[PDB]
Paper text:
Transthyretin (TTR) is a homotetrameric plasma protein (also present in cerebrospinal fluid) with two thyroxine binding sites. There are two structurally identical thyroxine binding sites in between the dimer-dimer interface with a line of 2-fold symmetry running across the binding channel (red line). In the absence of bound ligand, the tetramer is prone to dissociation and subunit misfolding that generates the precursors for amyloid fibre formation. Binding of thyroxine or other ligands could stabilise the TTR tetramer by forming non-covalent bonds to each monomer, effectively “securing” them in position.
Residue numbers in the entry:
A (entry chain A), D (entry chain A): 10 to 124
B (entry chain B), C (entry chain B): 10 to 98, 101 to 124
């Protein structure tokens, strides 16, 4: 599982469940092509986005739909999404975990990259 | 002014100076149209991006060129940039604050009357 | 001044106003001795805590009363407080910045010449 | 496992390994009594600090020795530790994960509390 996303809620002190996550890859024409998408489970994790075969080198964007998350909880948030854009696999295949921490007016993300 | 960006560096414990920042507004075709840009000053701040007349409601993206910042310091970065996307909806001033590390960033909004 | 504290609220997207802050310096018995305190102002800042003469090298704790802040807003908090502990070691100014959520906080130091 | 600690390194993009963690509990005399301690493993986690029997209500302090961590990596950091102080189990037993993200001049922590 070369790409995993974990999302926590800093208001409620809980995993963020049912958060939609969209991954794009920069194409040769310099536009964002759809790559993979999914939704977080009860523990706030999203596994199975991609495979070692599909996850080639490239510039990837992970868009976490934090807006819909907050709105479903009845809160009107600031940001449209939480994100990372990063170059992947440039020095060979890595495993990437994108960890996001959410509040209505703030987010942070971290990458954990292992070999 | 109605929009200010502030950038701090969590590695060096300092303001992030000479960071390039671009702001875009979402147009009707769902593309991003350049709106304003500049480079942070010694206190890590970027003032004078826009004006009350120009800064209308809509969806904005603040792109902070973090990769160039880290490369200039000789520190290996993860992210291409940081992209901070928000909707602007009485009298208001917005500050977009970012705290930078090589493999992480954090951003908050400070919206005041 | 040599030590400033700045507090932001990640829930409301605002400066954290009227937050109590206490600073302590570690004495030889490894106890904490009150050094300075105050409450944040409208921009979420606390200036005038100490003086150049008073602020010597040593180990300091900045305790931010986050639980009282969240209770005053009617928002359920996790932490008792936030305790920010650091060593103070040429010409320097320190800013201790904190970003608050009910179940999380983040803190950074901005150390400038 | 009622209390778990997870520590990530925001500079290297990795779990923070071999980080010492000390937990204290406020005693009836209002001093901090030692409660439990341990060190993070390869994935940056510390399990087995305590048990359901031992982890009673109380005010707890978790001190993560971030200073020794950075110094072992040859870096001189700002903070002595990363921490939380919190009241635990006041509305009955909960499971607590304390998630910490470290940089040389900054840290953040989050609590994940489940029933
Ligand atoms: C450990 C440390 C941090 C986290 C985060 C996080 C992102 N920003 N600050 C914290 C999200 C998800 N899991 C984590 C486990
Ligand atoms: C802790 C302390 C500061 C922040 C900032 C920030 C930039 N200027 N004032 C604060 C932005 C994002 N996260 C932070 C976490
Ligand atoms: Ca390559
Ligand atoms: Ca409006
Ligand atoms: Ca010295
Ligand atoms: Ca009770």
């Amino acid at each position: 599982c070369p790409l995993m996303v974990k999302v926590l809620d800093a208001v409620r002190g809980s995993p963020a469940i049912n958060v939609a996550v969209h991954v794009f890859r920069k194409a040769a024409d310099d536009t964002w092509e759809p790559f993979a998408s999914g939704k977080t489970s009860e523990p706030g994790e999203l596994h199975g986005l991609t495979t070692e075969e599909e996850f080639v080198e490239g510039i990837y964007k992970v868009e976490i739909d934090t807006k819909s998350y907050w709105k479903a909880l009845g809160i009107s948030p600031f940001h449209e999404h939480a994100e990372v854009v990063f170059t992947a696999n440039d020095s060979g295949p890595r495993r990437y975990t994108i960890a996001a921490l959410l509040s209505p007016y703030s987010y942070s993300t971290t990458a954990v990259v292992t070999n």
